[PDB]
């Protein structure tokens, strides 16, 4: 119908962003838990984003996928916009990558299947350029993976070491280089995710922004010796200066190494 803040109990902040925080929450009657994104909107003015958000939340409102975090509804009071969100109990793949220090091919190829499916759904719905770096990826009920994306970056207090300057590691050469982008943007990311999954760090990591840029644009990246070659093939194919040379999501999902180690 139409919600307002008084319909919700508020728990801890799950993450705190620059435009506001995501809080643990539950609808008061059903006692059903969700996540409430809170956007200050005075900060939105400056950043220049209001009305273009107010169309999105509609474009996102229509999106139904198991691997995408569902936006239930949205409202506003005076000074805040509220996104009513699905709760992902297990948090960020980023905390996890910190925990285990790296993943294996079963975990990886499985997540990658999950992502590829979201992106492909998104594409069929004419939605491109999701932010799939690990901090925006969440973990649902059992193992499952969920693209959050959407609102502007929230973190969970931790670590605090690599923060932003986590920036362009996942950015494709065409995006960085001040050019437009087709749907192909997202397969570059896919390739960077996979690498980080197995390696524990992204392929272009460097102490200076310009050097990171160097390797990205020049597609300069190596592998540690433990990376299976089917991984190598997939990543190598995924990361190409030319968007054209990059796969459609099909052959990604069809990829030998994927099919092998993918639990889904
Ligand atoms: O820290 C934790 O234990 C923790 C973090 C997140 C969650 N669940 C959740 N659900 C829906 C949205 C959302 N936003 C979000 C919050 C922080 C970072 C990134 C995102 Br994107 N977070 C649960 C526990």
Q: How far apart are CA 76 and CA 83, in angstroms?
A: 9
1 contacts: CB under 8 Å, gap ≥ 6? none
CATH number where 110 lies: 1.10.510.10
Domain around 27:
3-91
Q: How many distinct structural domains can be found in the chain? A: 2
213 contacts: CB under 8 Å, gap ≥ 6? 168, 176
- Bridge partners of residue 13, in order along the sequence: 23
DSSP 219: T
Instruction: Check whether residue 75 and residue 125 sit in a common domain.
Output: no
CATH number where 38 lies: 3.30.200.20
22 contacts: CB under 8 Å, gap ≥ 6? 13, 14, 15, 16, 35, 36, 37, 38, 85, 151, 154
Q: How far is the CA of 89 from the centre of ligand 1 (A)?
A: 8
Contact 115, 67 (CB under 8 A): yes
Q: How far apart are CA 98 and CA 93, in angstroms?
A: 9
**Enzyme catalytic residues:** 131
Q: How far apart are CA 176 and CA 172, in angstroms?
A: 6
State the maximum Cα–Cα separation within the chain, in Å, rounded to a whole number: 56
DSSP 135: G
Residue whose Cα lies nearest atom 7 of ligand 1: it is 91
Instruction: Check whether residue 70 and residue 164 sit in a common domain.
Output: no
Helices 185-199, 229-238: inter-axial angle, 10-degree rounding: 150
Q: How far apart are CA 150 and CA 71, in angstroms?
A: 10
Contact 247, 191 (CB under 8 A): no
Instruction: Check whether residue 96 and residue 86 sit in a common domain.
Output: no
**Is the distance from the beta carbon of residue 130 to the nearest atom of ligand 1 less than 6 Å?**
no
Q: How far is the CA of 194 from the centre of ligand 1 (A)?
A: 21
**Is the distance from the beta carbon of residue 147 to the nearest atom of ligand 1 less than 6 Å?**
no
Q: How far apart are CA 261 and CA 264, in angstroms?
A: 9
Pick the closest to residue 255 from 173, 177, 187, 170 (CA basis).
187
Question: In Å, what resolution does this model reach?
Answer: 2.8
Method: X-ray
Q: Return the sign of the alpha-carbon dihedral for residues 260, 261, 263, 264.
A: negative
Task: Characterize 156-185 residue by residue with b for buried, 16 or more Cβ atoms within 10 angstroms of its Cβ, and e for exposed.
Answer: eeeeeeeeeebebbbbbbbbeeeeeeebbb
Q: How far apart are CA 103 and CA 199, in angstroms?
A: 8
Instruction: Check whether residue 74 and residue 121 sit in a common domain.
Output: no
Pick the closest to residue 187 from 240, 258, 227 (CA basis).
240
Of ligand 1's listed atoms, the one at least distance from the Cα of 89 is 23
Q: How far apart are CA 14 and CA 18, in angstroms?
A: 14
Instruction: Check whether residue 113 and residue 75 sit in a common domain.
Output: no
- Bridge partners of residue 21, in order along the sequence: 16
| Domain final residue pick, 57, 91, 125 | 91
| Domain final residue pick, 91, 117, 140 | 91
Neighbours of 122 (CB within 10 A): 22
212 contacts: CB under 8 Å, gap ≥ 6? 168, 169, 204, 205, 206
Instruction: Check whether residue 14 and residue 96 sit in a common domain.
Output: no
Q: How far apart are CA 190 and CA 96, in angstroms?
A: 18
N- to C-terminal Cα separation, the chain: 36
Q: How far is the CA of 242 from the centre of ligand 1 (A)?
A: 34
Q: How far is the CA of 74 from the centre of ligand 1 (A)?
A: 18
Instruction: Check whether residue 162 and residue 231 sit in a common domain.
Output: yes
**Is the distance from the beta carbon of residue 154 to the nearest atom of ligand 1 less than 6 Å?**
yes
**Is the distance from the beta carbon of residue 35 to the nearest atom of ligand 1 less than 6 Å?**
yes
Q: Which tokens sit at 188?
A: 């570059």
Q: Which residues are annotated as a binding site for ATP?
A: 18, 37, 86-88, 135-136, 149
**Is the distance from the beta carbon of residue 155 to the nearest atom of ligand 1 less than 6 Å?**
yes
DSSP 68: B
């Amino acid at each position: 119908r139409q919600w307002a803040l008084e319909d919700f109990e508020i728990g801890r902040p799950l993450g705190k962003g620059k435009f506001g925080n995501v809080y643990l929450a539950r609808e008061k009657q059903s006692k059903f838990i969700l996540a409430l994104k809170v956007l200050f909107k005075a900060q939105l003015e400056k950043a220049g984003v209001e009305h273009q958000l107010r169309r999105e939340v509609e474009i996102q409102s229509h999106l139904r996928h198991p691997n995408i975090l569902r936006l239930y509804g949205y409202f506003h009071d005076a000074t805040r916009v509220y996104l009513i969100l699905e709760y992902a109990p297990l948090g960020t793949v980023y905390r996890e990558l910190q925990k285990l220090s790296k993943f294996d091919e079963q975990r990886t190829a499985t997540y990658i299947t999950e992502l590829a499916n979201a992106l492909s759904y998104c594409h069929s719905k004419r939605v491109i350029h999701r932010d799939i770096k690990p901090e925006n990826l969440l973990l649902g009920s059992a193992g499952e993976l969920k693209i959050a994306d959407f609102g502007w970056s929230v973190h969970a207090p931790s670590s605090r070491r690599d923060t932003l300057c986590g920036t362009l590691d996942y950015l494709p050469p065409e995006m960085i280089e001040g050019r437009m982008h087709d749907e192909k943007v997202d397969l570059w990311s896919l390739g960077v995710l996979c690498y980080e999954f197995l390696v524990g760090k992204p392929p272009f990591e460097a102490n200076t922004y310009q050097e990171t840029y160097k390797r990205i644009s020049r597609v300069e990246f190596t592998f540690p010796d433990f990376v299976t070659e089917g991984a190598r093939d997939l990543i190598s194919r995924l990361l190409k200066h030319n968007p054209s040379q990059r796969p459609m999501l099909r052959e990604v999902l069809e990829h030998p190494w994927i099919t092998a180690n993918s639990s889904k």
